[PDB]
Structures are given as C-alpha cells and as structure tokens.
Ligand binder design. Structure first.
Ligand SMILES: NC(=O)c1ccc[n+]([C@@H]2O[C@H](COP(=O)([O-])OP(=O)(O)OC[C@H]3O[C@@H](n4cnc5c(N)ncnc54)[C@H](O)[C@@H]3O)[C@@H](O)[C@H]2O)c1
Ligand SMILES: NCCC[C@@H](N)C(=O)NCCC[C@H](N)C(=O)O
Ligand SMILES: [Mg+2]
Ligand code: NA
Length: 258
C-alpha cells in the first residue's frame, strides 16, 4: 500500500541507524554505496520538493521527511508552499536543479540541468540489492530474492548484471516465470530450501522469509513494509537487518540523476 505518517516518525534517527547498519555490513556508508553505483557525489545541488494532492493526497510527514533526507546527504533542498502544478512552477522559479515529487503510482527525481530522471521503484531495488551483495562476510555469491515486482525485479536484474548467482521467488507464479524467462535467474523452491547468507526481500507482507533459508549472521536487505522477518527469528539467527522506509531509496534516486 502507501506510506503512512507513522512510518516516517523520527526519519533522522531511522536514517542514522540505517546508515550505521549499511557501514557495518558493507564497510561503506550510504554515500559510499551510491558513489560505487553511480560514481557521483553531492555538491549542494538545489532540490525542490513539490507536495502533490493527487489521488489519496498529501501524506503527513512525506515532504518534511524528503526535506530531512535531502539535507542529510548534503543537498540544498526546499519544500514549496503550493502543491501540484503551482508548486512545480514555484520550484523552477526559485531555482531548483532537481525536482522531487510523487503521486500514488510514481515517485521521481528529475534533474533539470542534465535531463536525467529516476523512478523510485527500480532505484530502491538496485541500492538494496547492491547493499545486500556487498556483505563483507558473505562467503558466497548466492543470493535469494523474495518478491519480483516493481522493486524486486530491477534489484534481481542488477544482481545478475553484477555476476551473482540469483535465486528468485514470488508467490505470484506469473511474476516468477517472467523473471526466470527474461533474466535467467534460478527459481527458488520453498519446499527445497537451502541456507543463504545474502537475502533481498521486496514485498508488502510479513513473514515472507522462512527459517530454513537463514544462516547465522546473514544479511537481510529489505525496503518492504512491514518487516519480512519476525523479531524472534532476527534475534535467533543474529540477522543483519537493512530496512528503512524512504531515505535509502531516495538517496539512490538523487545520486543516479547527478
Ligand atoms: N523502503 C523504501 O524506500 C521503499 C521504496 C519503494 C517501495 N517500497 C516497498 O516495497 C514493497 C514492494 O514494492 P513493489 O512496488 O515492488 O510491490 P509490487 O506489488 O510491485 O511487488 C511485490 C511482490 O511481492 C510478492 N509477494 C507477496 N507476498 C509474497 C510471499 N509470501 N512470498 C513471495 N513473494 C510475495 C507479490 O506477489 C508481488 O509480486 C512495498 O511494501 C513498498 O511499499 C519501499
Ligand atoms: N514508489 C511507489 C510506491 C507509492 C509511491 N508512488 C508513493 O509513496 N506515493 C507517495 C505520495 C506522496 C504524496 N502525494 C505527498 O506529496 O505527500
Ligand atoms: Mg528506503
Ligand atoms: Na515485507
């Protein structure tokens, strides 16, 4: 579904904790990961955030959180007073170089200076898949991808391009076939589980990661909401959790259009 205000409470602490976890797992902070993916770094580019009333409308804490996220990664960001088209105009007129705005189906970053444009879905799948894959103590190039939709598919695509051995599952058999037929990934059978130390999950569902596939100290990299693994299992296998509701995906978008 959609983000709620409650998901975005204390976004600064959520981002701090996510950054620490990415550092622990991969040896790089989120800036470092983006640098590896896109070769870019921030130089205080001016970023206009435009609230949008379309569909379900303005989500409490959404623009405020993007404002914090952008500032956190060193951008010169602002949120427009007006929403929608009037907000867009305001943003361009106040000198935005990059526009950031979302409706219920599309969240984008558009860099007006160089024409590059990012969609949040593939940009999130890519960065979370990248983070998972750079797990320093992995000891294997096998990775399990659970969820092969708009976030998951591009994530798996990235891992295949990066020369990882990708096993894929989606509860929707048509989506699983599309992935094996277009990407050439290996289909994972829940009934014949093997342990993974690298796991990437991209679903809107809880408890999608069976106990049988967790190895001790494995990384679980998931944009998904709610959380893919119960607290109990996460504690029991000392699982290294990378999960954060907006900022890591947002960083991936911004750095990709620089
Ligand atoms: N943290 C972030 O910044 C961020 C950014 C974008 C999206 N998301 C979240 O990521 C999640 C997925 O996004 P999406 O757009 O790819 O959704 P999607 O609907 O395009 O794909 C989700 C897939 O998960 C599959 N699925 C559901 N239950 C499953 C199960 N038990 N086992 C295996 N697969 C299962 C579905 O069949 C579906 O194909 C959503 O919760 C979304 O809110 C988070
Ligand atoms: N990436 C796909 C998942 C859903 C996405 N399009 C979204 O979060 N919409 C957010 C809507 C923001 C709202 N219009 C606002 O400006 O507050
Ligand atoms: Mg995120
Ligand atoms: Na989930």
């Amino acid at each position: 579904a959609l983000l709620t205000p409650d998901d975005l409470i204390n976004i600064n602490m959520q981002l701090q904790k996510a950054d620490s976890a990415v550092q622990e797992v991969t040896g790089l902070d989120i800036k470092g990961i983006c640098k590896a993916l896109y070769g870019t770094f921030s130089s205080s580019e001016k970023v206009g955030i435009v609230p949008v009333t379309s569909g379900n409308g303005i989500i409490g804490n959404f623009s405020a959180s993007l404002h914090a996220i952008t500032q956190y990664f060193g951008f010169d960001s602002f949120v427009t007073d007006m929403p929608d088209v009037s907000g867009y105009y305001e943003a361009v007129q106040n000198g935005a170089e990059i526009i950031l705005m979302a409706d219920d189906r599309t969240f984008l970053a558009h860099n007006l200076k160089n024409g590059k444009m990012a969609n949040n879905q593939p940009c999130t799948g890519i960065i979370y898949a990248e983070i998972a894959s750079r797990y320093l103590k992995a000891d294997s190039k096998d990775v399990l991808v659970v969820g092969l939709g708009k976030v998951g598919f591009p994530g798996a695509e990235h891992l295949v391009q990066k020369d990882f051995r990708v096993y894929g599952y989606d509860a929707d058999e048509t989506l699983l076939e599309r992935a094996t037929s277009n990407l050439g990934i290996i289909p994972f059978d829940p009934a014949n589980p093997k342990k993974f130390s690298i796991i990437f999950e991209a679903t809107p569902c809880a408890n999608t990661i069976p106990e049988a596939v967790l190895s001790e100290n494995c990384v679980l990299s998931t944009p998904g909401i709610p959380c893919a693994i119960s607290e109990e299992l996460r504690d029991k296998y000392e699982v290294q959790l990378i999960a954060e509701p907006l900022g890591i995906g947002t960083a991936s978008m911004l750095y990709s259009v620089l």
